């Protein structure tokens, strides 16, 4: 609850890097999309629907964590 | 519908020193209401001179359907954009005007809003 | 030339005030002119301080080269007052035979060393050196815990570093750095010792 | 210098824009001045020092 509620540049980038790559080995696609062929292209549309099957494990540096959804974050 | 008008003597043609072959950036002074104002003026389809009595009507809108305000000779478009006795600079693309004077009857003013002149030589 | 004579009182008198011990203010703040009453015999000890805590014990050796046998002039009357903490204001230096003597009898008394012209400037009123606040042992379970951090791990400042002997800390001590800033002016950083 | 606040009137209507801040502003500001500097922040994890390296270096 004490790590900052914004989603960094480098949760994006790793939520649509593995976003893309499930996407990729026919995971299920919660966007319904419309003809888009890149997998990269539908991870975005998946963000901004705020539909990602994905929580990121937020690693405080003495060792305790901190989970947070991607439907529970403020995406740029 | 007519925001400011007056009578106006353009005194310096160009205070500075000719700095474009278009548009030279007058310095006038009214008739009775002080209202001092820098206008530029494109000289080219328009040419004044010095000491050139001419009129000038500061409107909001000018009512070739409707039949336009066209008793005027050399008509602009533009916006107002800041209010600082008020300045009031106008902008008409990139052409300022910067009426002075006399808060009282400069009250049809405001920011943020499109303004004709209707100017004319007498 | 007496403002070091003086100015030298006046920085340890600054010092172990900062050091925590209970000096008088009108003792604190001398002009020259207030020890213009010794001012003629000292160059042509006189000067030595016992202050205790809210006891430190000064000496001022007029030998410029302090040796061995100096130290052991004021050894005996170290432990006859049953005082713990000495400071050793030389002029020139320690015999580097004689800095032994200090860490051989070191748990028992310590007694610190500082040269005349390291002191002949306090610099902790210096404008590069920010004020450094010695932490107390609950301040720094409050440090790590806030941080979760282990007492290693902080940033470290030397125990012989001129701030530290400055404040007189031993090893495992966290001194709290409030750097000033111009955004801010609270920029806080601690400092464990070595 | 002029225009009296009285209640917002008086008889020239066009001094009341010398210094406008009308409170829908002023409360845009603040939301703005806000989220302005809570995006400016350090991302975590950033790689600092290598930024630094570069800023240095270049």
Known sequence: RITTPYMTKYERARVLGTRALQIAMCAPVMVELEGETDPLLIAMKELKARKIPIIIRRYLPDGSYEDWGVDELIIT | ?122 | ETYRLWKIRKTIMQLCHDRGYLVTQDELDQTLEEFKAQSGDKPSTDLTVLVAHNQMFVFFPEEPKVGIKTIKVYCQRMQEENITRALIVVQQGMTPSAKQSLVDMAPKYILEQFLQQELLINITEHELVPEHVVMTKEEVTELLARYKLRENQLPRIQAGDPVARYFGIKRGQVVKIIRPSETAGRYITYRLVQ | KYGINDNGTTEPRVLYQLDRITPTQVEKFLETCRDKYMRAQMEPGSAVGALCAQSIGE
């Open chain 2, 1 to 122: 519908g007519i925001l400011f008008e007056d009578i106006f003597d353009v005194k310096d043609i160009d205070p500075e020193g000719k700095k474009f072959d278009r548009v030279s950036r007058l310095h006038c002074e009214s008739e009775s209401f002080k209202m001092d104002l820098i206008l530029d003026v494109n000289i080219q389809i328009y040419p004044v001179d010095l000491g050139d009595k001419f009129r000038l009507v500061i409107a909001s809108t000018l009512y070739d359907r409707p039949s336009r305000a066209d008793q005027f000779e050399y008509v602009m478009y533009g916006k107002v954009y800041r209010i600082e006795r008020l300045s009031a600079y106008v902008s008409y693309g990139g052409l300022l005007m910067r009426l002075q004077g006399d808060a009282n009857n400069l009250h049809g003013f405001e920011v943020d809003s499109r303004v004709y002149l209707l100017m004319k030589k007498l």
